[PDB]
């Protein structure tokens, strides 16, 4: 009963699919979508989204930034704005990035700037997290 | 008949030309179109026989980009080949030189450039080492110093 | 015939000579300025 | 309210820096080809 | 005369290999524009599925617009950069006789020369550097940011673009741009859940990087 | 004949989309690399006065051009290169250069020959 | 020679083009290449004179744009470029006219405008007082009023 | 002598770039009714309000109307500086300073 639609500015990974659950990591905590659930409209951080498809099996991407919104009539857009298979990153980029930003945190001492240096770090955090 | 047949008779052609005097630059001589038996680098030495083709490349070069330019305009131009066009206008006026006898035409001064002048000039220009100045600077000017000297002035004053 | 749009005359050899123009007396404006 | 809106920032900035440390992560076999068709050459006036 | 006609048969010839030789390139050009506009297409107007289905009628009642203007800085394109022209000018009127005050954007040279003469107190922010490389997210969250970051709190806006139909055919449409106030204080938005003013920022400005980078793909 | 083959139609194909330069930056890579052996082997053509060449350091010199051993070096240095591997050719391989003169063709050793001669020059080349 | 002998023994020449006539302009007189002698504000009066001066000078421009208009097509022109360009297009329109002689072959009733209504419509055509209609309802007409109402039997 | 090399050099930058508005109001000054000819002191001091900027702000199509009632100005009031400037040839910073305060004084009062 639910149409997904899962893109990127140069990928659509779904369109209009017909799914059974999907997790997102929107800002205010995780949720998972099935059929008819309630409308809401969120936008995501730093995580996975797992995908399952109706044979019982499961896909999983890793979205940087975007939003959702599931609709009234069952249909759920999910646009994030870098979304990469998990295979495609590695542990140790993630690791060394979020040691740097660490440093540069303790490091840094305007408000501005270190909010950038944090929005970084749970980057990455989430990254090493959701890898393994 | 009267000119094609005097051209076998003459070892230093100069062909003056009417699209060059409308520039306003003076002497109208057509530099794609002067000969010299003796522009030989055997003759001349080298660096004076590489100068004068690397002149006369240039402003090949210019006449086969003027068509581009004016299709797409200056604006679309590749970066390599906008310093072409500065470089191949800032020759243009550099050849331009003026004479005593013009003094009253021209207002300005005679000028009698030197030879090794000449080819430092035009190897100075073909370099880049100029690229900086303005191309009003290099018209009717002597060696490369009075474009210098001008370019100072034309800034001081505006 | 490499410079034949402007060695004929005409429009398109009078709209670039123009256009020559135009960006060569910005360029030396902004090359005079800077000086 | 997250603490970077207290900051100041917006959520395009927050979406850069995490979709850039996103591409940082990649392995070098597509780290370059996803830097170009994620750049950008816009340029104020 | 002889020549007369030699320097012309000249001088047209080579006006026809020129443009022969642009025409080839805009034609590579056009591919892998049709090729990435199918993914931009779907997640464009995925970004814009929501303010149908909520329908979200704007306030027709508030003074401040914004009015973007979508096109390249190169030229020679025909009759896109002065459709987009004729359409802000004519929004620009029909707003500005109801007293709205209108703020313009331009998103690309040729936009900011056509109208930068006639409209130049009504006027925001500019971009350049558009055309010559294919647009990108890179773009789009650009432009968006310093909209952001302009100190002009619009109360509705409007981009105009050329929404692309076939190789032939093209049509200048033009999609809204709503602020906070008007989706939280929308009755149809009641429906959605955890919804809060906070939500309702993140997502506005995110949907005015996906509108953004939507038309420049078109 | 072998080389001038190869030479003729690099040089027509060249003609054909050469009016694609001054926008070849923005075209297939087939076309750009019509472009480049296109004026790789122009450049090639070029020649001083009164210095005419043995057919033998022609038929050399065009073989390192339509064989591709010109495509990584830039335009302005194959005038350049052009004489130094000359030079090269006429002091060290005079063997390679007496056997193409005696045979008039390019055999198999004498392809051979010719290709390590060009790879070695063309790496240690500056 | 002989038409360029006797055009020193005229006070006013016509000179009529083939390519006037084949865009169905009649009389294929042709705007500038047509002169004559009391063409001098003392004789004709400073308006008459202003006005033909007017008309010539926006043919010359038209004229001029040719070349661009052919190759690069109508979008390339400025927005000063366009009007004259429209303007010049319904005067030479305009110029036309069905003769009382050529009725027999077009059915077209023929059409004799006095002078003073030839200066008018011509005067408001440059002034930009039609800039709205199509440029169809100048051709074959006779005063301006013709001119208007072929514009409004064509809506 | 001296104001036709300005005129001239103007004209020619002018014809380069077809300033713009300066190389307009001298063309349009060049212009010349029939059987009207100057005198060689009203045709500089006519080219002077043209060259000296003492025309870069009026209407293209009333600059013709200016010049001749300009003209009729001078012809009517200041024939001694018209005689000086023919007598002498040449032009004094006097009769300059002169005529620039005539050409300053009818453009306010134009």
């Given at each position: 009963q639910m149409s997904f639609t899962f893109a990127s500015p140069t990928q659509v990974f779904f369109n209009g699919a017909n799914v059974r659950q999907v997790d997102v990591p929107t800002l205010t905590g995780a949720f998972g979508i099935l059929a008819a659930h309630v409308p809401t409209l969120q936008v995501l951080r730093p995580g996975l989204v797992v995908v399952h498809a109706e044979d019982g099996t499961t896909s999983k991407y890793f979205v940087s930034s975007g939003s959702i919104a599931v609709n009234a009539d069952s249909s759920v857009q999910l646009l994030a704005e870098e979304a990469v298979t998990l295979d495609m990153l590695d542990l140790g980029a993630a690791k060394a990035n979020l040691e740097k930003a660490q440093a540069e945190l303790v490091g840094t001492a305007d408000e501005a700037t270190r909010a950038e240096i944090q929005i970084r770090i749970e980057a990455n955090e989430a990254l090493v997290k959701a890898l393994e | 008949p009267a000119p094609a047949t005097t051209f076998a008779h003459l070892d230093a052609t100069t062909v003056l030309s009417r699209a060059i005097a409308e520039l306003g630059i003076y002497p109208a001589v057509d530099p794609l179109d002067s000969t010299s038996r003796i522009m030989d680098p055997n003759i001349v030495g080298s660096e004076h026989y590489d100068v004068a083709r690397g002149v006369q490349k240039i402003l090949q070069d210019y006449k086969s980009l003027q068509d581009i330019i004016a299709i797409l305009g200056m604006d679309e131009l590749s970066e390599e080949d906008k310093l072409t066009v500065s470089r191949a206008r800032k020759i243009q006026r550099f050849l331009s030189q003026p004479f005593q006898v013009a003094e009253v035409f021209t207002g300005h001064m005679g000028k009698l450039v030197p030879l090794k002048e000449t080819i430092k000039g035009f190897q100075q220009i073909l370099a880049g080492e100029y690229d900086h100045l303005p191309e009003q600077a290099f018209y009717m000017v002597g060696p490369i110093e009075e474009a210098v000297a001008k370019a100072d002035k034309l800034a001081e004053e505006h | 015939g490499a410079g034949s749009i402007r060695e004929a005359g005409g429009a398109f050899g009078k709209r670039e000579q123009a256009e020559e123009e135009r960006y060569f007396r910005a360029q030396s404006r902004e090359q005079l300025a800077a000086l | 309210v997250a603490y970077w809106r207290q900051a100041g920032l917006s959520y395009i900035r927050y979406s850069q820096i995490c979709a850039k440390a996103v591409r940082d992560a990649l392995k070098t076999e597509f780290k370059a080809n996803a830097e170009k068709t994620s750049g950008s050459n816009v340029k104020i006036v | 005369t002889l020549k007369d006609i030699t320097r012309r048969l000249k001088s047209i010839k080579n006006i026809q290999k020129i443009t022969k030789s642009m025409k080839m390139v805009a034609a590579a050009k056009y591919a892998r524009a049709e090729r990435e506009l199918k993914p931009a297409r779907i997640y464009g107007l995925g970004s814009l599925a929501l303010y149908e289905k909520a329908d979200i009628?704007?306030?027709?009642?508030?003074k401040k617009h914004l009015l973007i203007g979508v096109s390249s800085d190169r030229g020679l394109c025909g009759a896109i950069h002065s459709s987009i022209a004729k359409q802000m000018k004519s929004e620009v009127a029909t707003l500005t006789a109801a007293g709205k005050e209108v703020m313009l954007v331009g998103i690309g040279d040729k936009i900011r020369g056509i109208l930068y003469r006639t409209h130049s107190d009504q006027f925001l922010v500019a971009f350049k550097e558009v055309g010559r490389k294919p647009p990108t997210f890179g773009d789009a969250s650009v432009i968006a940011l310093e909209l952001l970051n302009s100190g002009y709190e619009f109360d509705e806006g409007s981009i105009i673009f050329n929404k692309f139909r076939s190789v032939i055919s093209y049509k200048t449409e033009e999609k809204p741009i709503f602020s906070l106030n008007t989706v939280a204080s929308?009755?149809?938005?009641?429906?959605?859940?955890?919804?809060?003013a906070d939500v309702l920022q993140n997502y506005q400005e995110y949907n005015l990087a996906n509108i953004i980078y939507y038309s420049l793909k078109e | 004949k072998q080389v001038a083959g190869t030479m003729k139609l690099e040089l027509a194909q060249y003609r054909e989309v050469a009016a694609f330069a001054q926008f070849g930056s923005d075209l297939d890579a087939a076309t750009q690399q019509l472009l480049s052996r296109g004026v790789r082997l122009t450049e090639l053509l070029k020649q001083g006065q009164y210095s005419p060449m043995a057919i033998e350091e022609q038929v050399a010199v065009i073989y390192a051009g339509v064989r591709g051993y010109l495509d990584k070096l830039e335009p302005s240095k194959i005038t350049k290169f052009e004489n130094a591997f000359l030079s090269h050719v006429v002091s060290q391989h005079q063997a390679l250069l007496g056997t193409i003169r005696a045979d008039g063709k390019i055999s198999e050793q004498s392809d051979a020959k010719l290709k390590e001669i060009v790879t070695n020059f063309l790496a240690g080349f500056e």
């Amino acid at each position: 009963q639910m149409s997904f639609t899962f893109a990127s500015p140069t990928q659509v990974f779904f369109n209009g699919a017909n799914v059974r659950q999907v997790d997102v990591p929107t800002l205010t905590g995780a949720f998972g979508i099935l059929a008819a659930h309630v409308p809401t409209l969120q936008v995501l951080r730093p995580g996975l989204v797992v995908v399952h498809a109706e044979d019982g099996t499961t896909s999983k991407y890793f979205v940087s930034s975007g939003s959702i919104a599931v609709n009234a009539d069952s249909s759920v857009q999910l646009l994030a704005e870098e979304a990469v298979t998990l295979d495609m990153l590695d542990l140790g980029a993630a690791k060394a990035n979020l040691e740097k930003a660490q440093a540069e945190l303790v490091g840094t001492a305007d408000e501005a700037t270190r909010a950038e240096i944090q929005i970084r770090i749970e980057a990455n955090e989430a990254l090493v997290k959701a890898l393994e | 008949p009267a000119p094609a047949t005097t051209f076998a008779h003459l070892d230093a052609t100069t062909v003056l030309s009417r699209a060059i005097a409308e520039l306003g630059i003076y002497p109208a001589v057509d530099p794609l179109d002067s000969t010299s038996r003796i522009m030989d680098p055997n003759i001349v030495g080298s660096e004076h026989y590489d100068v004068a083709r690397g002149v006369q490349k240039i402003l090949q070069d210019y006449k086969s980009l003027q068509d581009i330019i004016a299709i797409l305009g200056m604006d679309e131009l590749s970066e390599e080949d906008k310093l072409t066009v500065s470089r191949a206008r800032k020759i243009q006026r550099f050849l331009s030189q003026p004479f005593q006898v013009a003094e009253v035409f021209t207002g300005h001064m005679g000028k009698l450039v030197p030879l090794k002048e000449t080819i430092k000039g035009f190897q100075q220009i073909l370099a880049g080492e100029y690229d900086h100045l303005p191309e009003q600077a290099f018209y009717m000017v002597g060696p490369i110093e009075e474009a210098v000297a001008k370019a100072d002035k034309l800034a001081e004053e505006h | 015939g490499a410079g034949s749009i402007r060695e004929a005359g005409g429009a398109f050899g009078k709209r670039e000579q123009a256009e020559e123009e135009r960006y060569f007396r910005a360029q030396s404006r902004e090359q005079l300025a800077a000086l | 309210v997250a603490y970077w809106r207290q900051a100041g920032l917006s959520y395009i900035r927050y979406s850069q820096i995490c979709a850039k440390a996103v591409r940082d992560a990649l392995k070098t076999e597509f780290k370059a080809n996803a830097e170009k068709t994620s750049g950008s050459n816009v340029k104020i006036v | 005369t002889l020549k007369d006609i030699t320097r012309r048969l000249k001088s047209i010839k080579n006006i026809q290999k020129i443009t022969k030789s642009m025409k080839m390139v805009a034609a590579a050009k056009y591919a892998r524009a049709e090729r990435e506009l199918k993914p931009a297409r779907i997640y464009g107007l995925g970004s814009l599925a929501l303010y149908e289905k909520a329908d979200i009628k704007g306030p027709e009642d508030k003074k401040k617009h914004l009015l973007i203007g979508v096109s390249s800085d190169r030229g020679l394109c025909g009759a896109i950069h002065s459709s987009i022209a004729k359409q802000m000018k004519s929004e620009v009127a029909t707003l500005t006789a109801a007293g709205k005050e209108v703020m313009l954007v331009g998103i690309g040279d040729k936009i900011r020369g056509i109208l930068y003469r006639t409209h130049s107190d009504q006027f925001l922010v500019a971009f350049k550097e558009v055309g010559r490389k294919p647009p990108t997210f890179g773009d789009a969250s650009v432009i968006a940011l310093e909209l952001l970051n302009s100190g002009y709190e619009f109360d509705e806006g409007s981009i105009i673009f050329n929404k692309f139909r076939s190789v032939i055919s093209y049509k200048t449409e033009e999609k809204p741009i709503f602020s906070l106030n008007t989706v939280a204080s929308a009755d149809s938005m009641s429906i959605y859940d955890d919804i809060d003013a906070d939500v309702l920022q993140n997502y506005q400005e995110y949907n005015l990087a996906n509108i953004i980078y939507y038309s420049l793909k078109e | 004949k072998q080389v001038a083959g190869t030479m003729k139609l690099e040089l027509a194909q060249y003609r054909e989309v050469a009016a694609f330069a001054q926008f070849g930056s923005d075209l297939d890579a087939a076309t750009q690399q019509l472009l480049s052996r296109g004026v790789r082997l122009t450049e090639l053509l070029k020649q001083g006065q009164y210095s005419p060449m043995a057919i033998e350091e022609q038929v050399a010199v065009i073989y390192a051009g339509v064989r591709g051993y010109l495509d990584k070096l830039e335009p302005s240095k194959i005038t350049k290169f052009e004489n130094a591997f000359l030079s090269h050719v006429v002091s060290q391989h005079q063997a390679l250069l007496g056997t193409i003169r005696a045979d008039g063709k390019i055999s198999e050793q004498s392809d051979a020959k010719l290709k390590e001669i060009v790879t070695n020059f063309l790496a240690g080349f500056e």
